[PDB]
């Protein structure tokens, strides 16, 4: 859905934007658990996992937020697996004290586990030159996987290897970047790595609120990074 000349420059990011992006993709807290269920709803298009956290320094409950009633209805009252980044700062006003919020991150549990862990191949280009990416960098045990699960893993590696969301003074050389989740069937999801209004940490991950899921079978990821 995006061409390279239309990629947003890192220099456009205002204020706390880079710091927020680095936190959400490299210093995050993730819910990663299997075979859970809830049909408790707070309001809106949400599933509330009461007492999800037993040893968190602030949270007791996890609130999952979705875009629509059709999406929440797919998962409400079903055995699901979770894989997403949560935080209190992701909640809308009036969410209960000690509740943390995640956007999407849910998949049906049943019949979704692969027998062999899927290593998702990555094609990465930096200023047009291919760079080798370890095959274990992005992996999943799910047949139907959230784009969130794959994007969190890919961007954590981009921060570690290329200092993606570091300032220019802290060796963050990449100025533009695109990630594509290239499926066998289905138009591919693509995200501009510098496309968000990063200064609003509460909505940074609202892109995942659609709970988009894709088939991992035979898929791969393409990453295009530019230093200008
Ligand atoms: Zn591709």
Curated annotation (Swiss-Prot):
Consequence when changing residue 222 to A: Loss of interaction with the beta chain of HLA-DR1 through the zinc-dependent site
InterPro entries in the record: Enterotoxin (IPR008992), Staph/Strept_toxin_CS (IPR006126), Staph_tox_OB (IPR006173), SuperAg_toxin_C (IPR016091), Superantigen_bac (IPR013307), Toxin_b-grasp_Staph/Strep (IPR006123), Toxin_bac (IPR006177)
Pfam families: Stap_Strp_tox_C, Stap_Strp_toxin
Essential cofactor(s): Zn(2+)
Residues that hold Zn(2+) according to the record: 182, 220, 222
Gene Ontology CC entries for this record: extracellular region
Keywords (A to Z) from UniProt: Disulfide bond, Enterotoxin, Metal-binding, Secreted, Signal, Superantigen, Toxin, Zinc
An example molecular function term from Gene Ontology annotations: metal ion binding
Disulfide-bond pairs as recorded: 91-101
UniProt function note: Staphylococcal enterotoxin that activates the host immune system by binding as unprocessed molecules to major histocompatibility (MHC) complex class II and T-cell receptor (TCR) molecules. In turn, waves of cellular activation, cytokine production, and migration into the lung tissue and airways occur via alphabeta T-cells. Also causes the intoxication staphylococcal food poisoning syndrome. The illness is characterized by high fever, hypotension, diarrhea, shock, and in some cases death.
Note: This toxin seems to be coded by a bacteriophage.
Subunit composition and interactions: Monomer. Interacts with MHC class II molecules alpha/HLA-DRB1 and beta/HLA-DRA chains. The interaction with MHC-II molecules occurs at both zinc-dependent and zinc-independent sites. Interacts with T-cell receptor beta variable 7-9/TRBV7-9.
Protein name: Enterotoxin type A
Gene: entA
């Amino acid at each position: 859905e995006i061409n390279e000349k239309d990629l947003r420059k890192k220099s456009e990011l205002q204020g706390t934007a880079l710091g927020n992006l680095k936190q959400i993709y490299y210093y995050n807290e993730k819910a990663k658990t299997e075979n859970k269920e809830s049909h408790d709803q707070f309001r809106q298009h949400t599933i509330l996992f009461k007492g999800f956290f037993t040893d968190h320094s602030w949270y007791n409950d996890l609130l999952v937020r979705f875009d629509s009633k059709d999406i929440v209805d797919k998962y409400k009252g079903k055995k699901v697996d979770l894989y997403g980044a949560y935080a209190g700062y992701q909640c809308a006003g009036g969410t209960p004290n000690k509740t943390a919020c995640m956007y999407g991150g849910v998949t049906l549990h049943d019949n979704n586990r692969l027998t062999e862990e899927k290593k998702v191949p990555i094609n990465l280009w930096l200023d047009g030159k291919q760079n080798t990416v370890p095959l274990e960098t992005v992996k999943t045990n799910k047949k139907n996987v959230t784009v969130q699960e794959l994007d969190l893993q890919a961007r954590r590696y981009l921060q570690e290897k290329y200092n993606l969301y570091n300032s220019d003074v802290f060796d963050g050389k990449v100025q533009r970047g695109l990630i594509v989740f290239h499926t066998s069937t289905e138009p591919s999801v693509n995200y501009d790595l510098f496309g968000a209004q990063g200064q609003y940490s509460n909505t940074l991950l609202r892109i995942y609120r659609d709970n988009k899921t894709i088939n991992s079978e035979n898929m791969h990821i393409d990453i295009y990074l530019y230093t200008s």
